[PDB]
Design an enzyme around this catalytic site. Sequence first.
Site, PDB file in Angstrom:
ATOM      1  N   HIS A 142      37.982  52.556  37.104  1.00  0.00           N
ATOM      2  CA  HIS A 142      39.149  51.686  37.260  1.00  0.00           C
ATOM      3  C   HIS A 142      38.711  50.229  37.352  1.00  0.00           C
ATOM      4  CE1 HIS A 142      43.241  50.805  39.194  1.00  0.00           C
ATOM      5  NE2 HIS A 142      42.544  49.735  39.530  1.00  0.00           N
ATOM      6  N   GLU A 143      37.712  49.950  38.186  1.00  0.00           N
ATOM      7  CA  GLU A 143      37.252  48.571  38.363  1.00  0.00           C
ATOM      8  C   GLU A 143      36.642  47.999  37.087  1.00  0.00           C
ATOM      9  OE1 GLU A 143      38.574  47.400  40.872  1.00  0.00           O
ATOM     10  OE2 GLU A 143      38.887  49.265  42.005  1.00  0.00           O
ATOM     11  N   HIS A 146      39.157  46.940  34.565  1.00  0.00           N
ATOM     12  CA  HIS A 146      39.761  45.620  34.729  1.00  0.00           C
ATOM     13  C   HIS A 146      39.006  44.569  33.917  1.00  0.00           C
ATOM     14  CE1 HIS A 146      43.074  46.289  37.411  1.00  0.00           C
ATOM     15  NE2 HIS A 146      42.342  46.795  38.391  1.00  0.00           N
ATOM     16  N   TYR A 157      48.130  39.433  35.911  1.00  0.00           N
ATOM     17  CA  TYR A 157      48.158  40.386  37.028  1.00  0.00           C
ATOM     18  C   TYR A 157      49.394  40.224  37.918  1.00  0.00           C
ATOM     19  CZ  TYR A 157      45.858  43.822  40.081  1.00  0.00           C
ATOM     20  OH  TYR A 157      45.499  44.925  40.819  1.00  0.00           O
ATOM     21  N   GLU A 166      47.210  47.590  35.691  1.00  0.00           N
ATOM     22  CA  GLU A 166      46.868  48.645  36.645  1.00  0.00           C
ATOM     23  C   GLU A 166      46.825  50.025  35.998  1.00  0.00           C
ATOM     24  OE1 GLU A 166      45.874  49.332  39.799  1.00  0.00           O
ATOM     25  OE2 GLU A 166      45.106  47.298  39.419  1.00  0.00           O
ATOM     26  N   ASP A 226      52.776  42.813  46.497  1.00  0.00           N
ATOM     27  CA  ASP A 226      51.794  43.424  45.611  1.00  0.00           C
ATOM     28  C   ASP A 226      51.889  42.834  44.204  1.00  0.00           C
ATOM     29  OD1 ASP A 226      49.751  45.320  44.775  1.00  0.00           O
ATOM     30  OD2 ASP A 226      51.343  46.726  44.173  1.00  0.00           O
ATOM     31  N   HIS A 231      50.621  47.854  41.698  1.00  0.00           N
ATOM     32  CA  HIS A 231      50.105  49.173  42.062  1.00  0.00           C
ATOM     33  C   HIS A 231      51.215  50.200  42.299  1.00  0.00           C
ATOM     34  CE1 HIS A 231      46.755  46.434  43.274  1.00  0.00           C
ATOM     35  NE2 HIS A 231      46.037  47.387  42.704  1.00  0.00           N
TER      36      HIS A 231
HETATM   37  C1  LIG Z   1      41.399  52.521  42.569  1.00  0.00           C
HETATM   38  C2  LIG Z   1      41.616  52.021  43.991  1.00  0.00           C
HETATM   39  C3  LIG Z   1      40.835  52.858  45.009  1.00  0.00           C
HETATM   40  C4  LIG Z   1      41.242  50.545  44.104  1.00  0.00           C
HETATM   41  C5  LIG Z   1      42.182  49.584  43.358  1.00  0.00           C
HETATM   42  N1  LIG Z   1      41.596  48.267  43.534  1.00  0.00           N
HETATM   43  P1  LIG Z   1      42.076  46.992  42.440  1.00  0.00           P
HETATM   44  O1  LIG Z   1      43.355  47.414  41.751  1.00  0.00           O
HETATM   45  O2  LIG Z   1      40.991  46.621  41.483  1.00  0.00           O
HETATM   46  C6  LIG Z   1      42.431  45.619  43.573  1.00  0.00           C
HETATM   47  N2  LIG Z   1      42.304  44.338  42.931  1.00  0.00           N
HETATM   48  C7  LIG Z   1      43.040  43.320  43.327  1.00  0.00           C
HETATM   49  O3  LIG Z   1      43.845  43.333  44.244  1.00  0.00           O
HETATM   50  O4  LIG Z   1      42.666  42.224  42.657  1.00  0.00           O
HETATM   51  C8  LIG Z   1      43.273  40.953  43.083  1.00  0.00           C
HETATM   52  C9  LIG Z   1      42.280  39.925  42.517  1.00  0.00           C
HETATM   53  C10 LIG Z   1      42.638  39.087  41.480  1.00  0.00           C
HETATM   54  C11 LIG Z   1      41.701  38.159  40.998  1.00  0.00           C
HETATM   55  C12 LIG Z   1      40.407  38.057  41.532  1.00  0.00           C
HETATM   56  C13 LIG Z   1      40.049  38.902  42.589  1.00  0.00           C
HETATM   57  C14 LIG Z   1      40.983  39.826  43.061  1.00  0.00           C
HETATM   58  C15 LIG Z   1      43.575  49.693  43.949  1.00  0.00           C
HETATM   59  O5  LIG Z   1      44.393  50.466  43.446  1.00  0.00           O
HETATM   60  N3  LIG Z   1      43.826  48.967  45.037  1.00  0.00           N
HETATM   61  C16 LIG Z   1      45.119  49.038  45.705  1.00  0.00           C
HETATM   62  C17 LIG Z   1      44.971  48.961  47.228  1.00  0.00           C
HETATM   63  C18 LIG Z   1      44.060  50.065  47.797  1.00  0.00           C
HETATM   64  C19 LIG Z   1      46.382  48.910  47.917  1.00  0.00           C
HETATM   65  C20 LIG Z   1      46.247  48.596  49.421  1.00  0.00           C
HETATM   66  C21 LIG Z   1      47.306  47.835  47.263  1.00  0.00           C
HETATM   67  C22 LIG Z   1      47.142  50.251  47.746  1.00  0.00           C
HETATM   68 ZN   LIG Z   2      43.271  47.879  39.829  1.00  0.00          ZN
END
Ligand SMILES: CC(C)C[C@H](NP(=O)(O)CNC(=O)OCc1ccccc1)C(=O)NC[C@H](C)C(C)(C)C
Ligand SMILES: [Zn+2]
Length: 316
Positions: A142-143, A146, A157, A166, A226, A231
């Site tokens: 997933h990461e 991105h 985003y 997402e 969010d 998400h």
């Molecule tokens: C797969 C999961 C385990 C991890 C995934 N991380 P991601 O989606 O990669 C978060 N990324 C993000 O918020 O980036 C913002 C940003 C933007 C620009 C530079 C830096 C940062 C996610 O689904 N997170 C959601 C979390 C847990 C909740 C609390 C909202 C439910």
């Molecule tokens: Zn993500």
Amino acid sequence: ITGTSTVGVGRGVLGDQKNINTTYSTYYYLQDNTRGNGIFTYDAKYRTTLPGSLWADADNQFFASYDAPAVDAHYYAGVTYDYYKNVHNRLSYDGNNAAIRSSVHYSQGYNNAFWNGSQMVYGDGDGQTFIPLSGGIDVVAHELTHAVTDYTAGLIYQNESGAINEAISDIFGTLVEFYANKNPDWEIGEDVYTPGISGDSLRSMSDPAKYGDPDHYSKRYTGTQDNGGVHINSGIINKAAYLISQGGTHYGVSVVGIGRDKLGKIFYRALTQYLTPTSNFSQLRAAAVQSATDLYGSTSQEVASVKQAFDAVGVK
Ligand SMILES: CC(C)C[C@H](NP(=O)(O)CNC(=O)OCc1ccccc1)C(=O)NC[C@H](C)C(C)(C)C
Ligand SMILES: [Zn+2]
Ligand SMILES: [Ca+2]
Ligand SMILES: [Ca+2]
Ligand SMILES: [Ca+2]
Ligand SMILES: [Ca+2]
């Protein structure tokens, strides 16, 4: 660093032994030279300054508890690289073998993981909501996805484009999990979420509503939390993707499944040839239909199933 390629062994977050590609120069570093221009894993040492230090180990054995998140971030980045190269003919996230960098032990009690524009970052979790997040292959993929999105479609985003962003990360995270073929499912984060609760997960693609996420456009979130629900509203697209692959009848609309490989081909083509930074859900439908048309023909079952799946989730 300059050195010679080596093979270490260690234990991941869940306790499983695996071999890892390292580099020797005085220390053994988490630097895999076998893939592209390298995969590099760093220690953030419970702080928030990035990337931290390239992970160094005296003996090439990674069995300490502190080592486990690094083992898995490093190893699962390799699996994800292999998926993109072998399945989609894509060389790293930029298509030109950019070095892949990850930091583990980010912050304290940190219940998340992210791509920061330049690298992957993994919290350890607080032991209640998450254990160290690199223990999930779907999470790692997933990461990294991105980064792929940011180099290709560039989906902004927030709001619908952000929910597509997402969902793309959840779709490819799941397809990588199936590629590795260890306990694969259509759930997100189950291996690292809520160690005290069995059988749950952070999101479900097969039934997003199980965790409160919409499974139909008429249930989309329109508020500002969010980033406008990125998400949350991802569940609408995740459900469509699940239906394309696996089939089903959803709100009375029947979808003929075409399987995971064709799902991945359709969505990879849409991501890389049709989506733009501002694409909305309707535009994703059109991109997926066109992608399936390119790959399989206008009269194909694959095109018909894409249309059925978007109909089932209320996206025209
Ligand atoms: C797969 C999961 C385990 C991890 C995934 N991380 P991601 O989606 O990669 C978060 N990324 C993000 O918020 O980036 C913002 C940003 C933007 C620009 C530079 C830096 C940062 C996610 O689904 N997170 C959601 C979390 C847990 C909740 C609390 C909202 C439910
Ligand atoms: Zn993500
Ligand atoms: Ca060691
Ligand atoms: Ca699984
Ligand atoms: Ca999963
Ligand atoms: Ca759990």
